[PDB]
RNA sequence: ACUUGAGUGCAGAAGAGGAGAGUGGAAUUCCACGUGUAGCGGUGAAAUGCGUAGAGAUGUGGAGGAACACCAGUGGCGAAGGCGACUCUCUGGUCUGUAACUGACGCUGAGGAGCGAAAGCGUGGGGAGCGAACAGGAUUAGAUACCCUGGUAGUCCACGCCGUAAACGAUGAGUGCUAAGUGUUAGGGGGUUUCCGCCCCUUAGUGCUGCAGCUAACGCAUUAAGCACUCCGCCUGGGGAGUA
RNA sequence: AAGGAAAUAAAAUGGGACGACGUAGCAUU
């Protein structure tokens, strides 16, 4: 049964041999994704997500792809959870202390602009402070209130996010996400074989995962 | 050619273990049948099947993995080679990893392992080890 | 490009004929490369052999 | 060619389908080696033909050894027919 | 699964080799301190540290080792079976012995085994004598060790069925 | 089988050309060969001058022999001045 | 006792594979002749050299010796060295579908035997061009060299001899197993199409990128330096010395 | 006009040499 999802871009022969057990074939050198397997894996995905949420999950939604930035941002905002749509900075976890210092500086400077003396100098402010505010809101907006490391990690393209995947594996933090035909399946803890370049597919998947997250509060 | 069947079988099993495969095809042979049955009854193999064909017959083995990712079989090594034969007496039967592993031996009363050999105080061709 | 021979399925170039060989030879009389005519390696080799055979019998101009 | 081979096969045939028995192959090898030698009596500089002849002779000797180890009477009869000594 | 660094470790250093880095203005010196940190009960860790001062490098190496430890099955204060570490041309053999032989090993190997909570071991280096490679080989051999209960579980067998 | 194609010099009268052609055809058949067919292109413009003539009379002959008659034809063509050029190709 | 390794048979494929004979037009040199004149050639610069005897250049013809432009492509063959004009006689090996044939007849291989780049040597030719030695001219403080102008042996041929190369993939031979992506040569089969053609699979050969694995690193990676078996050869610090 | 297989034009002649010997710290607070 093909659910509302349209996640079968099937990603022609730029593929990975380690994903042979989740693919059909078509006469275009392209491997029709096995929708049946995804319908089953998504069940354990929802289960693990709800369990971790009931346990206090702080899932980080990460995707450095134009097709996913706005989607993940909207999903995290409507769900009130964390996310990272812009560049994935190096050492979010390994160097969590430096990121914490940077975001504390961001908090100080963003509380100063309306509570502190926002008119110290006529040019210094406009010259540096507001530009730095914009840059830091861009590079840290979705994680501006982390306050602690999460229990698990969510991604959308490990092939593009190899750095985050590697550091999470180093910190042995469970990572979830969608694996593309060219991605590494074994490296993920909770794998979902499906297409990712489609905005509709990623939107639906993120929405369902955020719903599963929110349902744990009940 | 190939100079022997046993080393070929053992190294093919080792390669399958390294790549983490789930099946294997081997030209069936009586000695290979006995060795596979021994490995099976010992717990290294989850199950084994045999195929009697017109050419050589095929013995198919299924590698065992009892957890998320853990090779029940870590390494293989042959001892008696076609050119350097190794024979051990009942008093010199070699233990493997203080008895943690197991070794295969060909005797007159049948193919026996280290434990069965010690039980029967047998000895003969020490062909390979299993870890 | 496509091979003339395969497109026509013709074989046994029959060197004595020159109507076909005229096209594959340049104005100065030099043989054309395979990358230009898009011909196949086997057919290219056979055609060059026939072209040399014809040249040897004053059927094609060594120079012009 | 293709005619002497037929005659040799018929002469050294054990059955209607016999076309790979050691005797037939040995006779063919002997005929070919004799022809190649006759050729070599003029083209002394063709060493590749000499290498081919050496390979043919090695094959013939291995086949003769196999026949002798399998059947002695057949080996002797083949030598007598071919006079290969 | 990494274990936490909250343990009563000994942080015994091994050695400190002086390092040099060339620059237009001559040479530039650095102190590379390699330290082994561990507890006397199955917990041990190797670490390295580089700095312009000896104690700073020592602290860096201590922290690094604390950030990566490993367990070891001290079966009766001895290894359950013999194994060989072959990490980067470093060949170090390890054998179990009686309960009175003691720690017979080289300097770095001896320190590692002492901070590992092992009493009686037989060892011998059959390769490079470099402390770092020797320590890496020892740690590799320790990680490759096997326990009777885990093998029994994997083999669908009992411990007494295995060794009895 | 072999294809024997040669060029007769143009400065030869019709009857003399016929006599030369008959002679060279007998040379082949006289050695046990058999001709299967012939073809004549008449006077054609040569790509280049051989000795002095710009044109020549191309004569074609298809022969099946035991590599003997063709050798005699080759040996005799090099001597006769009637033939300017000639070649031999195995029809296979 | 058996066909899977091996070899034979059938029907097909390619190739600078080799030996022998013959043939071909460009191009250099020389010679003869016709036209014709202050030079030609050459270097960073110049010089040496040939030239008013008629050069160089141009046109026709003739002579002779070497190599085969375009094709030409990590393309092909060969055990290796190595092999590029074309026709013919002889001859070797490789590959593709077998099932018809024998049913283990197989791998390696001390010694031995043979082949073996170029150079060199003996015998006799041949000698156009190139060119060790050598001659002359620039050069520098010097130039027995780099540069230029000439030039013997040699480079070619038939027989014989020596048997050396970075004779390199600096990686011995045979067998079996160990993710993929992308060109190419020779082939075969099929899913529609008689085709042209697209796709999939299946052998061998030749390249590129890459997982595990290996490696001190470089890097190798189904053509291994991976996982193993069999055989032979080779090393035990450098110089001395491949010398006595 | 992008990292490039057998493969590469254009492109000062002229710069020959620098005796001997050897100069460095380093951790518990």
Curated annotation (Swiss-Prot), chain C:
Induction behaviour: Strongly expressed during exponential growth, decreases 2-4-fold in stationary phase, part of the rpsF-ssbA-rpsR operon. The operon is induced by DNA damage by mitomycin C.
Gene Ontology CC annotations of this record: cytosolic small ribosomal subunit
GO biological process: translation
A single MF term (Gene Ontology): small ribosomal subunit rRNA binding
Keywords noted in UniProt: Ribonucleoprotein, Ribosomal protein, RNA-binding, rRNA-binding
Protein purpose: Binds as a heterodimer with protein bS6 to the central domain of the 16S rRNA, where it helps stabilize the platform of the 30S subunit.
Subunit description: Part of the 30S ribosomal subunit. Forms a tight heterodimer with protein bS6.
Family of the protein in this entry: Belongs to the bacterial ribosomal protein bS18 family.
Entry protein name: Small ribosomal subunit protein bS18
Residues of the full protein shown: 14 to 77 of 79
From Swiss-Prot, chain D:
GO cellular component: cytosolic small ribosomal subunit
Stretches the record annotates as Disordered: 1-21
Coiled-coil residue spans: none
Pfam families: Ribosomal_S15
InterPro entries: Ribosomal_uS15 (IPR000589), Ribosomal_uS15_bac-type (IPR005290), uS15_NS1_RNA-bd_sf (IPR009068)
Compositional bias of kind Basic and acidic residues: 1-18
Alphabetized SUPFAM superfamilies for the sequence: S15/NS1 RNA-binding domain
Domain of life: Bacteria
Example GO BP: translation
Sample GO molecular function, one term: structural constituent of ribosome
Assembly with partners or alone: Part of the 30S ribosomal subunit. Forms a bridge to the 50S subunit in the 70S ribosome, contacting the 23S rRNA.
Family: Belongs to the universal ribosomal protein uS15 family.
PANTHER family cross-referenced by the UniProt entry: RIBOSOMAL PROTEIN S15, BACTERIAL AND ORGANELLAR, SMALL RIBOSOMAL SUBUNIT PROTEIN US15M
HAMAP family in the cross-refs: Ribosomal_uS15_B
Function in brief: One of the primary rRNA binding proteins, it binds directly to 16S rRNA where it helps nucleate assembly of the platform of the 30S subunit by binding and bridging several RNA helices of the 16S rRNA.
Protein name: Small ribosomal subunit protein uS15
Protein source organism: Bacillus subtilis (strain 168)
Phylogenetic classification of the source organism: Bacteria, Bacillati, Bacillota, Bacilli, Bacillales
Gene: rpsO
Swiss-Prot record, chain E:
Short name of one Pfam family: Ribosomal_S5
Alphabetized PROSITE patterns for the sequence: RIBOSOMAL_S5, S5_DSRBD
Disulfide pairings: none
Domain of life: Bacteria
Domain S5 DRBM as annotated: residue spans: 9-72
GO molecular function: rRNA binding; structural constituent of ribosome
Any single GO CC term annotated in Swiss-Prot or TrEMBL for this entry: cytosolic small ribosomal subunit
Record carries keyword Transmembrane: no
Protein keywords: Antibiotic resistance, Ribonucleoprotein, Ribosomal protein, RNA-binding, rRNA-binding
UniProt-listed GO biological process terms: response to antibiotic; translation
SUPFAM superfamilies: dsRNA-binding domain-like, Ribosomal protein S5 domain 2-like
Role this protein plays: With S4 and S12 plays an important role in translational accuracy; many suppressors of streptomycin-dependent mutants of protein S12 are found in this protein, some but not all of which decrease translational accuracy (ram, ribosomal ambiguity mutations).
HAMAP family, per the entry: Ribosomal_uS5_B
Swiss-Prot/TrEMBL domain comment: The N-terminal domain interacts with the head of the 30S subunit; the C-terminal domain interacts with the body and contacts protein S4. The interaction surface between S4 and S5 is involved in control of translational fidelity.
UniProt xrefs under NCBIfam families: rpsE_bact
Record text on subunit structure and interactions: Part of the 30S ribosomal subunit. Contacts proteins S4 and S8.
Further comment found in the protein's record: Altered S5 proteins have been identified in a number of mutants. Some mutations in S5 have been shown to increase translational error frequencies.
Protein name in UniProt: Small ribosomal subunit protein uS5
Source species of the chain: Bacillus subtilis (strain 168)
Lineage summary: Bacteria, Bacillati, Bacillota, Bacilli, Bacillales
Gene: rpsE
Curated annotation (Swiss-Prot), chain F:
GO cellular component: cytoplasm; ribonucleoprotein complex; ribosome
MF-aspect GO terms: small ribosomal subunit rRNA binding; structural constituent of ribosome
SUPFAM superfamilies linked: Ribosomal protein S6
Cystine pairings recorded for this chain: none
GO BP: translation
Keyword hit for Lipid biosynthesis: no
Induction notes from the record: Strongly expressed during exponential growth, decreases 2-4-fold in stationary phase, part of the rpsF-ssbA-rpsR operon. The operon is induced by DNA damage by mitomycin C.
A Pfam family hit: Ribosomal_S6
InterPro entries: Ribosomal_bS6 (IPR000529), Ribosomal_bS6_CS (IPR020815), Ribosomal_bS6_sf (IPR035980), Ribosomal_S6_plastid/chlpt (IPR020814), Transl_elong_EF1B/ribsomal_bS6 (IPR014717)
Keywords per UniProt: Ribonucleoprotein, Ribosomal protein, RNA-binding, rRNA-binding
Keyword field contains ATP-binding: no
HAMAP family, alphabetized: Ribosomal_bS6 (MF_00360)
PANTHER family, per the entry: MITOCHONDRIAL 28S RIBOSOMAL PROTEIN S6, SMALL RIBOSOMAL SUBUNIT PROTEIN BS6M
NCBIfam families in the record: S6
Family designation: Belongs to the bacterial ribosomal protein bS6 family.
Subunit structure of this chain's protein: Part of the 30S ribosomal subunit.
Chain's role: Binds together with bS18 to 16S ribosomal RNA.
Protein name: Small ribosomal subunit protein bS6
Organism: Bacillus subtilis (strain 168)
Gene (name only): rpsF
């Amino acid at each position: 049964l093909l659910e509302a999802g349209v996640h079968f871009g099937h990603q022609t022969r730029r593929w990975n041999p380690k994903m042979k057990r989740y693919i059909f074939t078509e006469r275009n050198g392209i491997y029709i994704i096995d929708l049946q397997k995804t319908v089953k894996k998504v069940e354990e995905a929802y289960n693990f997500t709800k369990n971790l949420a009931a346990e206090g999950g702080k899932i980080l939604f990460v995707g450095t792809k134009k097709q996913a930035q706005d989607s993940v941002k909207e999903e995290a905002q409507r769900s009130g959870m964390y996310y990272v749509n812009q560049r994935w900075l190096g050492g979010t976890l390994t160097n969590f202390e430096t990121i914490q210092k940077r975001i504390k500086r961001l908090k100080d400077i963003e509380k100063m602009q309306e509570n502190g003396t926002f008119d110290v100098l006529p040019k210094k402010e406009v010259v540096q402070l507001k530009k730095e505010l914009e840059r830091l809101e861009k590079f840290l907006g979705g994680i501006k209130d982390m306050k602690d490391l999460p229990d698990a990690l969510f991604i959308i393209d490990p092939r593009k996010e190899r750095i985050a995947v590697a550091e999470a594996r180093k910190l042995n933090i469970p990572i979830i996400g969608i694996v593309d035909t060219n991605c590494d399946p074994d490296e993920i803890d909770v794998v979902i074989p499906a297409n990712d370049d489609a905005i509709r597919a990623v939107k639906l998947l993120t929405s369902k995962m955020a719903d599963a997250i929110l349902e744990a509060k009940q | 050619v190939m100079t022997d069947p046993i080393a070929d079988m053992l190294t093919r099993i080792r390669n399958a273990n390294m790549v983490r495969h789930e099946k294997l095809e081997i030209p069936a042979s009586k000695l290979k049948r006995e060795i596979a049955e021994i490995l099976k009854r010992e717990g290294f193999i989850r199950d084994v099947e045999f195929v009697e064909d017109s050419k050589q017959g095929i013995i198919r083995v299924f590698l065992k993995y009892g957890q998320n990712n853990e090779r029940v079989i870590t390494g293989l090594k042959r001892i008696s080679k076609p050119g350097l034969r190794v024979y051990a007496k009942s008093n010199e039967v070699p233990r493997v990893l203080n008895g943690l592993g197991i070794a295969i031996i060909s005797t007159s009363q049948g193919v026996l392992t280290d434990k069965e050999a010690r039980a029967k105080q047998a000895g003969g061709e020490v062909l390979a080890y299993v870890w | 490009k496509v091979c003339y021979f395969t497109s026509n399925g013709i074989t046994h170039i029959d060197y004595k004929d020159v109507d076909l060989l005229k096209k594959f030879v340049s104005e100065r009389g030099k043989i054309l490369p395979r990358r230009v005519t898009g011909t196949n390696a086997k057919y290219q080799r056979k055609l060059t052999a026939a072209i040399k055979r014809a040249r040897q019998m004053a059927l094609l101009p060594y120079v012009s | 060619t293709q005619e002497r081979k037929n005659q040799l096969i018929n002469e050294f045939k054990t059955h209607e389908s016999d076309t790979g028995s050691p005797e037939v192959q040995i006779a063919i090898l002997t005929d070919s080696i004799n022809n190649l030698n006759e050729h070599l009596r003029t083209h002394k500089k063709d060493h590749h033909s000499r290498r081919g002849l050496l390979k043919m002779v090695g094959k013939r000797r291995n086949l003769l050894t196999y026949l002798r180890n399998k059947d002695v009477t057949r080996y002797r009869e083949l030598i007598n027919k071919l006079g290969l000594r | 699964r990494i274990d936490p660094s909250k343990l009563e470790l000994e942080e015994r250093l091994v050695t400190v080799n002086r390092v040099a880095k060339v620059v237009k203005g001559g040479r530039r010196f650095r102190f590379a301190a390699l330290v082994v940190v561990g507890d006397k009960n199955g917990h041990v860790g190797f670490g390295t540290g580089k700095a312009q001062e000896v104690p700073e490098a020592i602290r860096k190496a201590v922290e690094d080792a604390k950030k990566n430890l490993i367990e070891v099955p001290m079966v009766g204060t001895t290894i359950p079976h013999e194994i060989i570490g072959r990490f980067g041309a470093g060949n170090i053999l390890l054998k179990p012995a009686s309960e009175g032989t003691g720690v017979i090993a080289g300097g770095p190997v001896r320190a590692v085994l002492e901070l590992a909570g092992v009493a009686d071991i037989l060892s011998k280096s059959l390769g490079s004598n470099t402390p770092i490679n020797m320590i890496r080989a020892t740690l590799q051999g320790l990680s490759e060790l096997k326990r009777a209960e885990d093998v029994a579980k994997l083999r669908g067998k009992s411990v007494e069925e295995l060794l009895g | 089988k072999y294809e024997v194609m040669y060029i007769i010099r143009p400065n030869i009268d019709e009857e003399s050309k016929k006599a030369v052609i008959e002679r060279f055809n007998n040379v082949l058949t006289s050695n046990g060969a058999e001709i299967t067919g012939t073809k004549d292109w008449g006077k054609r413009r040569l790509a280049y001058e051989i000795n002095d003539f710009r044109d020549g009379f191309y004569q074609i002959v298809n022969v099946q022999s035991d590599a003997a008659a063709v050798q005699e034809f080759d040996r005799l063509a090099k001597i006769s001045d009637d033939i300017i050029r000639h070649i031999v190709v195995k029809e296979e």
